Structure formats: structure tokens, C-alpha cells
């Protein structure tokens, strides 16, 4: 194998929500941890979770696993399953009521135009012209509104 790997890739954070049903501590707790790379999350979620090739009955209990904690007929079967628990992406969708995510930059940029011309979150400040997708940004654009400007009438 070989690749250009020009420059540095994208730094994405991962999380393995492991909710043990046999846990005697409530409310049900999840596996608190993080990783800088996928591989690191694999060796863990697999060994640090599903265990190694030594464990016979291996079962992955996800905070909301689609399997509901079911056993497989092979190791590769389980290890391959957790593959869905990763779902690593470069950048989500700038739309709130979309929660959509893509693995391509052109896909998102092209999919963002298929949403609408105007933004959902518009500056609440009257006589102001802005655009936002998250109530956070807007509320952050107010830090500059606290004050006013006296000069150009038509603004
Ligand atoms: Zn974990
Ligand atoms: Zn699972
Ligand atoms: Zn979208
Ligand atoms: Zn404004």
C-alpha cells in the first residue's frame, strides 16, 4: 500500500458509548473515553470492550445498539458490527433540522444549496443584515450589538 498523505489530515474526536446491562450502578452509566484516531478506538472498543480472541461469548452493549445486545456466530462477525458504531465523518451538516452528515466536502457544499437560499437563524437585531444556522452563532453576534453607531444615517 501507498498514499500521498499530503500535509496533515483532519483531527476528529470519537466516543464509544458502552452501557453494561450487568452494571449494578445506576443510573446506567456509559464508557467515558475518547480517541484521536479510529484505529485507537477499534483496538479499545474491540479489546478494551468486546475483549480479545480469548473471550468466548462476546457481546457489545451500545447505549442504543441496533442489535439490542445479540451474540454472533464468529469473532469477525462482532468486530465487523462495531464498524457501524464508528461512523466517522469529516464535517456534519450546517442545518439544524437536518442532522445529516457527508464524507465529502463537495457533497455537503452542494447539499447545503439544496436546502434554501435564506438561513433559519436570522439576527434578531432589527435593521441588521446577517445569517446563521445555530442559535449559538446569532447569540454570539449580539456581543457587538450591545453598542450602537452614530454617523451614517442610511445603514
Ligand atoms: Zn469504550
Ligand atoms: Zn453494538
Ligand atoms: Zn443538510
Ligand atoms: Zn445583527
Whether the CB-CB separation of 90 and 48 falls below 8 Å is answered with no
Q: Which residues pair with 95 in a beta bridge?
A: none
From the candidate CATH numbers 3.10.50.40, 3.30.160.60, 3.40.50.300, 3.20.110.20, the one assigned to the domain spanning 117-155: 3.30.160.60
Helix, strand, or coil (residue 145): coil
Distance 113 CA to ligand 3 centre (A): 9
DSSP string, 85-144: HH---SEE-S-TTT--EES-HHHHHHHHTTT-SS-SB--SSTT----BSSHHHHHHSSTT
> 5: how many CB neighbours lie within 10 A of its CB?
7
Whether the CB-CB separation of 45 and 80 falls below 8 Å is answered with no
Which experimental approach was used here? NMR
What is the length of the chain? Answer: 155
Distance 89 CA to ligand 2 centre (A): 19
Whether the CB-CB separation of 43 and 49 falls below 8 Å is answered with no
E strand or H helix at 81, and its extent? helix 75-81
Q: What cell was used for 15?
A: 466516543
DSSP 47: I
Amino acid at each position: 500500500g501507498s498514499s500521498g498523505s499530503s500535509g496533515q489530515p483532519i483531527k476528529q474526536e470519537l466516543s464509544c458509548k458502552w452501557i453494561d446491562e450487568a452494571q449494578l450502578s445506576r443510573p446506567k452509566k456509559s464508557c467515558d473515553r475518547t480517541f484521536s484516531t479510529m484505529h485507537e478506538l477499534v483496538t479499545h472498543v474491540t479489546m478494551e470492550h468486546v475483549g480479545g480472541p480469548e473471550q468466548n461469548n462476546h457481546v457489545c452493549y451500545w447505549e442504543e445498539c441496533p442489535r439490542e445486545g445479540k451474540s454472533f456466530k464468529a469473532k469477525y462477525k462482532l468486530v465487523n458490527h462495531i464498524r457501524v458504531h464508528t461512523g466517522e465523518k469529516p464535517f456534519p451538516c450546517p442545518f439544524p433540522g437536518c442532522g445529516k452528515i457527508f464524507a465529502r466536502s463537495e457533497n455537503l457544499k452542494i447539499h447545503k444549496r439544496t436546502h434554501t437560499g435564506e438561513k433559519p437563524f436570522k439576527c434578531e437585531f432589527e435593521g441588521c443584515d446577517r445569517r446563521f444556522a445555530n442559535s449559538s452563532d446569532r447569540k454570539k453576534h449580539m456581543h457587538v450589538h450591545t453598542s450602537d453607531k452614530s454617523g451614517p444615517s442610511s445603514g
